[PDB]
Amino acid sequence: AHAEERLLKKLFSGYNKWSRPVANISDVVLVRFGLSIAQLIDVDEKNQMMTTNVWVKQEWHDYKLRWDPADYENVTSIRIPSELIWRPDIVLYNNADGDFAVTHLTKAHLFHDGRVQWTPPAIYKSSCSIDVTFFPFDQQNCTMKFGSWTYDKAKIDLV
Amino acid sequence: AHAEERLLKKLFSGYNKWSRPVANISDVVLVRFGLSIAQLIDVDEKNQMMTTNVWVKQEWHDYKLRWDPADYENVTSIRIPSELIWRPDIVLYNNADGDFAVTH
Numbered sequence: 001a002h003a004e005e006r007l008l009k010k011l012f013s014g015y016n017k018w019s020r021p022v023a024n025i026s027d028v029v030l031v032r033f034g035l036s037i038a039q040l041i042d043v044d045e046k047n048q049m050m051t052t053n054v055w056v057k058q059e060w061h062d063y064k065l066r067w068d069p070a071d072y073e074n075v076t077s078i079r080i081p082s083e084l085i086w087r088p089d090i091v092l093y094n095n096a097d098g099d100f101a102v103t104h105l106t107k108a109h110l111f112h113d114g115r116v117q118w119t120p121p122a123i124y125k126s127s128c129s130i131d132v133t134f135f136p137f138d139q140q141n142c143t144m145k146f147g148s149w150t151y152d153k154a155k156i157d158l159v
Numbered sequence: 160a161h162a163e164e165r166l167l168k169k170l171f172s173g174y175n176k177w178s179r180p181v182a183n184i185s186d187v188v189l190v191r192f193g194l195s196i197a198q199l200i201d202v203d204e205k206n207q208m209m210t211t212n213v214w215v216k217q218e219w220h221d222y223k224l225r226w227d228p229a230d231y232e233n234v235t236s237i238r239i240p241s242e243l244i245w246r247p248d249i250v251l252y253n254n255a256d257g258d259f260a261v262t263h
């Protein structure tokens with residue numbers, strides 16, 4: 001716990017959250033992006049919206065958050081606030097009456113090799129076109145478009 | 160008042176609210192958890208939803224916030240804002256268009 005305070009003091013001593021965490025400019029940050037649906041809250045046919053509860057599973061490597069476990073009483077991983085670190089700005093392009101980015105900001109699971117795991121919850125209201133030709137036997141196909149807003153492929157790449 | 164002010168200065172001199180409060184990492188923070196329902200605001204059968212007003216009683220042990228009352232004018236307990244200390248992030252998994260965590 002004194003190591004953890006020492007660890008957190010060490011990691012955030014000279015950390016800059018506004019700069020992409022790459023040791024080399026030409027490097028590209030790989031973001032492993034995956035969804036986990038909790039419940040399909042609503043499918044508003046009249047407004048052609050879909051409200052879903054998901055866990056936006058993200059994972060990227062931050063080269064400035066690495067430490068040797070042997071030097072810190074063998075700390076393998078720690079939980080750090082997500083508002084203190086640089087997180088990719090993945091937004092829902094086809095949003096409708098909802099939030100573009102993830103707003104909860106739960107803590108992230110940081111490992112000793114720089115890997116960061118972040119799985120915040122979210123409630124997204126995405127617009128999807130609804131066909132009611134065979135209602136009430138219809139089959140809707142509603143999509144969500146996720147991508148980094150500011151960073152292009154040469155800087156942030158999704159997996 | 161002076162005793163409590165000195166106690167507050169001492170307690171948070173080097174307190175890190177981001178670090179789990181255990182003297183030994185092998186320890187696990189036991190969080191005694193319990194609800195106290197206040198009123199069933201609504202049960203929306205149409206939306207398959209229930210709205211409740213509850214008090215999320217939580218209780219844990221923090222090791223870096225200990226003191227001897229004899230050294231602080233016999234002050235046994237104090238009230239401090241919850242945002243200044245480490246807290247468990249207990250949330251409602253099955254949330255439906257509502258706030259996940261405690262916001263007050």
Ligand SMILES: *[C@@H]1O[C@H](CO)[C@@H](O)[C@H](O)[C@H]1NC(C)=O
Pocket residue numbers: 024025026027
């Ligand atoms: C960054 O990557 C480029 C392209 O591979 C390489 O030429 C350059 O030497 C690298 N810089 C450092 C400091 O390693």
Ligand SMILES: *[C@@H]1O[C@H](CO)[C@@H](O)[C@H](O)[C@H]1NC(C)=O
Pocket residue numbers: 141143
């Ligand atoms: C659903 O929509 C996506 C994109 O519009 C399309 O690629 C896919 O083939 C569609 N599937 C069905 C079963 O309609």
Ligand SMILES: *[C@@H]1O[C@H](CO)[C@@H](O)[C@H](O)[C@H]1NC(C)=O
Pocket residue numbers: 182183184185186
């Ligand atoms: C922590 O607990 C483990 C096992 O209970 C023990 O081996 C170790 O010495 C303890 N360390 C401290 C600093 O109390």
Ligand SMILES: CC(=O)OCC[N+](C)(C)C
Pocket residue numbers: 148149150
């Ligand atoms: C540079 C910038 O802000 O681009 C945002 C728009 N988008 C997602 C179409 C690239």
Ligand SMILES: [Ca+2]
Pocket residue numbers: 042043044045
């Ligand atoms: Ca409906």
Ligand SMILES: [Ca+2]
Pocket residue numbers: 201202203204
């Ligand atoms: Ca009702």
